[PDB]
Amino acid sequence: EHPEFLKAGKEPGLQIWRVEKFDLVPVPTNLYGDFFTGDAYVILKTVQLRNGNLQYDLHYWLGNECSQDESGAAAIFTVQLDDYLNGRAVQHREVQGFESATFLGYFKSGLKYKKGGVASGFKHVVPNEVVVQRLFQVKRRRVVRATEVPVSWESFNNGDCFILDLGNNIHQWCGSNSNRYERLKATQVSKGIRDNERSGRARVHVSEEGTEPEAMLQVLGPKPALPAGTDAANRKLAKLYKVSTMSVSLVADENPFAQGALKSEDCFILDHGKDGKIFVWKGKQANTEERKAALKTASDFITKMDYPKQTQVSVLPEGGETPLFKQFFKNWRDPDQTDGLGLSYLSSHIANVERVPFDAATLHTSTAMAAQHGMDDDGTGQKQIWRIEGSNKVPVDPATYGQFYGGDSYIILYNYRHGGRQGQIIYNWQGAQSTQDEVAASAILTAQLDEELGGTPVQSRVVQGKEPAHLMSLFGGKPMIIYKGGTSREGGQTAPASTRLFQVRANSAGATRAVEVLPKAGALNSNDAFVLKTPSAAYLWVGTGASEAEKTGAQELLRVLRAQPVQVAEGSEPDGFWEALGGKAAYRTSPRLKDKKMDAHPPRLFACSNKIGRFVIEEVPGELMQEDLATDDVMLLDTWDQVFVWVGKDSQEEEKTEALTSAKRYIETDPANRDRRTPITVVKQGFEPPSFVGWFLGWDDDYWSVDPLDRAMAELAA
Amino acid sequence: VEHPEFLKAGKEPGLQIWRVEKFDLVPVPTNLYGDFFTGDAYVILKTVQLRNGNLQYDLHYWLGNECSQDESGAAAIFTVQLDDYLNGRAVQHREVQGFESATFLGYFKSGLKYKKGGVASGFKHVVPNEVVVQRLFQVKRRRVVRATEVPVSWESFNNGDCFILDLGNNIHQWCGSNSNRYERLKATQVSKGIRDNERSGRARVHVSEEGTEPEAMLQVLGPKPALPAGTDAANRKLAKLYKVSNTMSVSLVADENPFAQGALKSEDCFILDHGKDGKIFVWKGKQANTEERKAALKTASDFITKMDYPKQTQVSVLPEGGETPLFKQFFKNWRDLGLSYLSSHIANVERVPFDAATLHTSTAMAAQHGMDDDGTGQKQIWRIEGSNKVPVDPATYGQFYGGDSYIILYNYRHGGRQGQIIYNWQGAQSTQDEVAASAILTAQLDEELGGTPVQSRVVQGKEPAHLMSLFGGKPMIIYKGGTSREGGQTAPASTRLFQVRANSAGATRAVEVLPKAGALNSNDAFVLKTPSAAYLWVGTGASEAEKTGAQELLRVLRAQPVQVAEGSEPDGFWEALGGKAAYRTSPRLKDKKMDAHPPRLFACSNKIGRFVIEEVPGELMQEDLATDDVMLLDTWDQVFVWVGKDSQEEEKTEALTSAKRYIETDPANRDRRTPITVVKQGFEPPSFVGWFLGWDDDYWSVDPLDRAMAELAA
């Protein structure tokens, strides 16, 4: 029990200790983000779960020129502090330059890798005035890092940004070939020095090649000629091993894994090394020695498989698993939480998000509600529906609006209104039994209609059976009914199947959807109402979980089906029902996430590029901020229910046309084995729908009216 | 038809005011209702329409301080005789200047004006127009302001009150330097009342305070000199009941309340003595001699002389069968569409039956049923172990063991607003260290959540309606003892009896009770589990929801039921209770609950170290929620504590205690376990706001006094 242990993790916040001489010494709070390259640190992030318990993320950070003793000393402190916190903390091994996204999210003024350490006699605490003559190099995109560099022109290159810190004057230098997002972020390194390190009393001078002030030319000399500046299919696969010098044995050859494969007596390693991270899962009932040696366990597994030493390592206690970990498993369920608030773990970057329940009356006032439910509006706007025959849009009979045949593909042009600026959504619905010359036609025609309308409408491709929530809400109160095949083109109408089964599901908004499924018992579920119609009789089955909205939709389907139903509760019904299904087997009844879906699958922001033919994606750590949407990039906003494609105005055109495909490749490569039919929603810069903007607390509508870099330089210049 | 004015009296719902001039009744002009000459006496007839369609009469007569005994006696004579013209169905009130009843004050809360003069000095209400005016009013008090005419001089002024110097076409309101800013707010509709009613709109209102008096003011009053300074609760518990004979003598019948309703026989007249609280009631039996019934007012006067109560004591005379709710609450379990009496300040309230579908659209429905929402929002339940919140097993959500205390954090949505409720449930067998821990932990989490959540402390057995509705359709199950702690599990009782009661919303609650026949009730379903078998009893009154809840309780108890209607039951059912005795068969108030116990709003303070409460008369209005006060809203089923933003910290910390002490002192002998619900200004729940017709959500966005002064400054 260290004295620093007693101050650790008492209240939500961030705490940083430096390991100095086998002791924990606090880093001054205003310097959080500065890390000496020669040192090791311990970092405790305390989040307040909505259930009332506190959640602990324990990181230790190893600089590149770290000594072996203090590298080991940090590990000892994390192991011993996890114990002071009764083994409920999630532990992280972080090394300089390769830190986890979680760790990086704590500091979005960037981090600074300072030269020196305890061995060379350097501290964070500094006298009131101290002569400064440092230089920093700033590279990367999602989370910027400034590395202390030798004060010389040999450190410079055309393409990066540089901060030469002269004390009361901070000189930010932007290379000639630095594109303009990098200068913007390099400026919050400049201000961090001014505000945090100099208590405000300093000025920031920005310059580029050929406009260096004499103060800069005095220290570095005459400027010479500077030189130039200076992969996704890996993430799909992962294996699960069991831990017992200790050895390992494989348990699952490929993901998704069975949640039952983790037993509480042992420790497991989930190997995701080709993507740069390995997990260690501490069973509730493992040897005290195995749980205390989990970090050395991970170290030995990294040597054994010849993974890079910089590989990220996370250790998770049973019952405190992270959402990224649980997504490796098929249908993870925490036996606790369908009741209570939240789940075992609350991702730090959405811990501030206040949860808004859906209320149709006031939805038009809350972008938060629109995003948190995927509902741009209440669904009552004007709309036109086309069925695609051959290569043409053919208008659908307005009386049949809401009915969709699986042998067709459709286009919906919808006019939404929410808040202060109106917009349009183009839905491309592709039935599972539409001929793929027509599906492909529906795609092209969708893009054609987007550019006819000036290129501003949202485009969202949906596959039959995985319709987004806002799409079901477009038909007054009537349910969205989706037949498994056939066509509504005037030509060949067909004779309905002998015995058909429909599944009637509802969304946060009370709207309903009726999907045909093969008439078999293994396709039922207690969360929904169903409708089975035979030549004999007409059933309406109702699940234990099905509520009042599920049945209102279900009959109105009977009303369209030319029927009177037999109302039938779950488990207690005539034995004529299950003969109509050709027997009986198991069907899954575990309830749906609903309000906790955001807890189990927080939205994540990625950048993506198709350069040199390799797809590659970069997660953007920390809170979702509009500032991270680089106007020359195509971004991915994954909200689990759908993947948003944000295309910047100034992005390359080959990336713009491939926006749909890029998202499809993100889904195909997700280690969670995502549903291939997951809707993809392309979104243009400056015309983002509410269901996208709402995820960015502090979104400003005029953000791009003034160029972002030019505005930032106004704050420093005046 | 004693009088020509009698024929116009009480024909239509409204208010009627006559001044007693020369042993005659002459109408006060309607636009001047509220002005009263100190030298006169008035008769005031309030006519409200009962919910069945009949008219009910409240007859007041008002005695000014400078009233003559003859014209005061004439008012009393008229009150007795107009009660007679209305066939003796009226409740009569004796009101004296400055000490009027809350009922009387509710008629005028643009304030009252106590004018100088009277009939004897030849002054009338009707006056020629554009007439010279030079009057001065001192405006003190708080709940219902009173502006008394004072001499036009600086010697009438003081540091702390408000004053209106009425100059005719110019009305000057002066606010003393140390006048708190709610009283200035109140003086402001004293000022406009003169402007709108007395000056036909054509007049201007100039507000000023110490050191900014206009020259018009300094011309009339002179140079302003140095002004001087400005200028309980346990009484209401006890009351005694006497019987009246004839010269009058009295004899005691009930030493302390609650009284037996049967103690009043229809042959005699009774006096309920509550003089230490300032009121006495006299009760006229249906079949007493007219001679005693016509002298009820003189009887009350002489009884007040005998006990040396102050002359200003309020007097109400009640006819049998027409008693007021405040009167009936002195008796244990009073039994008579609507009821005998409808309190005036809720006669306009339209009653909303509960419909879950549109509850989110009607705050009125939320208040009238104690349901902030349908109960389906997200919630977290904690059990208190030692000094910690421990989350409950989600499988047992809805079950509560009486040997523990719990905290429930509930997220409600209603209309377009969000809110939170923290329920503190304290089991009857929880140890007092754990009870107290749950209390402290409750307050701790309220401040963790920014101080905005509603806090509601609940005692086992008196659960509010909205708490029972939180578990889908499953009933809130309440065991008599034991704990759900992962540590010591316990062995359930040999034979257990549950009482299954339902709410306005169909939600149910299953409360364990002693296995005795005298603990049954015809309105509810019951569940008896013995070692042998499990009965499910059903009452004459028990409905669909009562056994649906009762059934699923059997599902939790792992037992199969034998359905048993009341009066038609096996011997094993009555063996399992150890015999047979009488129990409760009187049906519940339900929709008439608001009629018998209308909501009432009080202000309370702990200043001087004594407790004090002041009732706020009239219609419940947001304006009466003084931002520097702690208010109590008693809805009988629950007591709301409304905490003003700008109240002292000693009062905020004692908000829970203040409500407990209000309950302890109620003469009705309220259930000590009555739920208390603390509520913060600007974060009021729908079940509170719904009682306030005209509630504005942005009312405090602009300061109330600043907004009021803009209306007069126009």
Q: How many angstroms separate the CA of residue A505 from the nearest CA in chain B? A: 19
DSSP-derived letter for residue A148 is E
Q: Which two tokens stand for residue B649?
A: 């910290």
**Span B588-714: which CATH code?**
3.40.20.10
Q: Which fold has domain B343-491?
A: Severin (3.40.20)
**CB < 8 Å to A338, chain B:** 394
Sorted by where each begins, the domain ranges of chain A are 1-125, 126-231, 232-346, 347-495, 496-591, 592-718
- Chain B, 310 to 329: residues with Cβ < 8 Å from chain A are none
Write the DSSP symbol of residue B315: E
Chain A partners of B379 at a C-beta cutoff of 8 Å? 339-341
Interatomic CA distance for residues B95 and B75, integer angstroms = 11
Q: Which of A51, A338, A357 sits opposite B413 (nearest CB)?
A: A357
Give the C-alpha separation, A99 to A95, whole Å. 6
Q: What residues of A are in contact with residue B416 (Cβ under 8 Å)?
A: 359, 361-362, 365
Query: A369 to chain B: which residues are within 8 Å by CB?
Result: none
- String of DSSP letters for A434-463: S-HHHHHHHHHHHHHHHHHTTT-SEEEEEE
Encoded amino acid at B43, one letter? V
Residue listed under structure tokens 């086998």 = A22
Contacts (Cβ under 8 Å, ≥6 apart) of A192: A33, A109, A110, A112
Handedness of CA B703, B704, B709, B712 (dihedral sign): positive
Task: CATH number for A347-495: choose from 3.20.20.70, 3.40.50.720, 3.40.50.360, 3.40.20.10.
Answer: 3.40.20.10
- Tell me whether residues B413 and A362 touch, CB distance under 8 A: no
Listed residue (B627, B619, B625, B628) closest to B640, CA to CA: B625
Residue labelled with tokens 């195909």: A668
CATH number of A496-591: 3.40.20.10
CB contact set of B89 (below 8 Å; sequence gap of 6+) = B56, B57, B319, B322
Of B360, B377, B380, the CB nearest to A340: B380
- B445 near A CB under 8 A: yes
Dihedral sign from CA coordinates of B564, B566, B569, B572: positive
At A578, give phi and psi (nearest 5°).
-80, -15
Alpha-carbon distance B357 to nearest alpha carbon in chain A (angstroms): 11
- Interatomic CA distance for residues A693 and A217, integer angstroms: 45
Contacts with B, A 329-348, CB within 8 Å: 336-341
Q: How many residues does chain B have?
A: 714
The Cα A565–Cα A558 span in angstroms is 7
Q: Do B343-491 and B588-714 agree at the fold level?
A: yes
Chain A residue with Cα closest to B397? A339
> Which amino acid, one-letter code, is at A385?
I
> Around B241, how many Cα atoms within 13 Å sit in the side-chain half-sphere?
21
Name the closest residue on chain A to residue B442, using Cα atoms: A52
**Scanning the structure block, which residue is given the tokens 């011997």?**
B571
CATH 3.40.20.10 fits B492-587, yes or no: yes
Contacts of B394 in chain A (CB under 8 A): 336-340
Question: Which residue of A52, A336, A357 is in closest CB contact with B394?
Answer: A336
Q: Between B378, B413, B416, which is nearest A341 by CB?
A: B378
- A50 shares contact with chain B (CB less than 8 Å): yes
User: What type of residue sits at position B271?
Assistant: I
Amino acid at A186: A
End-to-end CA distance of chain A, in Å?
Answer: 50
Residue B648: exposure state from Cβ atoms within 10 A (0-12, 13-18, ≥19) = middle
How far, in Å, are A487, A530, A541, A542 from residue A500 at the CA level? Answer: 16, 11, 13, 16
Indicate the residue of A52, A338, A365 with minimum beta-carbon distance to B380. A52
Resolution of the experimental structure, in angstroms: 3.0
Please give the CATH superfamily to which domain A232-346 belongs: Severin (3.40.20.10)
> Rounded to an integer, what distance in angstroms lies between the CA atom of residue B385 and that of residue A562?
59
Q: Which of B380, B452, B486 to mutate to test the interface with A (most CBs of A within 10 A)?
A: B380
Compare all CA atoms of chain A with the CA of B381 and give the residue at the minimum distance.
A340
- Among chain B residues, CA nearest to A11: B448
CATH architecture, range A592-718: 3-Layer(aba) Sandwich (3.40)
Cβ separation A341–B389 shorter than 8 A: no
Q: What is the CATH number of domain B233-342?
A: 3.40.20.10
Q: What is the DSSP letter of A400?
A: G
Q: Does A362 reach chain B within 8 Å, measured CB to CB? A: yes
- Give the gap in angstroms from C-alpha A567 to the nearest C-alpha of chain B: 19
Contacts made by residues B147-153, CB under 8 angstroms, sequence distance 24+: B147/B111, B147/B112, B147/B113, B147/B114, B147/B187, B147/B190, B148/B113, B148/B114, B149/B38, B149/B113, B149/B114, B149/B115, B149/B116, B152/B220, B152/B221, B153/B221
Cα–Cα distance for residue pair B228/B402, rounded to 1 Å: 59
Q: Which residues on adjacent β-strands are paired with residue B44?
A: B17, B60
CB pairs under 8 A between A and B: 45
- Class of the domain covering A1-125: alpha beta
CA distances from B409 to A638, B406, B507, B561 (A): 31, 10, 19, 34
Contacts of B378 in chain A (CB under 8 A): 341, 355, 357, 595
Q: How far is B348 from chain A (nearest CA, A)?
A: 29
Q: What is d(CA B320, CA B91) in angstroms, rounded to the nearest whole number?
A: 10
Beta carbons of A53 and B409 less than 8 Å apart: no
Q: Cβ B378–A51 below 8 Å, yes or no?
A: no
How many whole angstroms separate alpha carbon B41 and alpha carbon B70? 10
Select from A52, A361, A365 the Cβ nearest to the Cβ of B382: A52
**Residue labelled with tokens 């969000």:** B418
Q: Measured between alpha carbons, how far is A387 from A438 in angstroms, rounded to an integer?
A: 10
CATH T-level assignment (fold) for domain B1-126:
Severin (3.40.20)
**Location of structure tokens 């205003």:** A30
Phi first, then psi: what are they for A220, rounded to 5°? -100, -20
* Closest CA of chain B from A699, distance in Å: 22
A341, B381: Cβ pair inside 8 Å?
no
Method: X-ray
| Contact between chains at A359 and B394 (C-beta distance less than 8 A) | no
Name the H helices within B370-458: 432-448
DSSP-derived secondary structure for B504-571: TTS-EEEEEE-S-GGG-BTTSEEEEE-SS-EEEEE-SS--HHHHHHHHHHHHHHT--EEEEETT---H
Q: What string of DSSP letters covers A502-544? A: EEEEE-TTS-EEEEEE-S-GGG--TTSEEEEE-SS-EEEEE-S
Question: Can you tell me the distance from the alpha carbon of B482 to that of B404, in angstroms, rounded to the nearest whole number?
Answer: 8
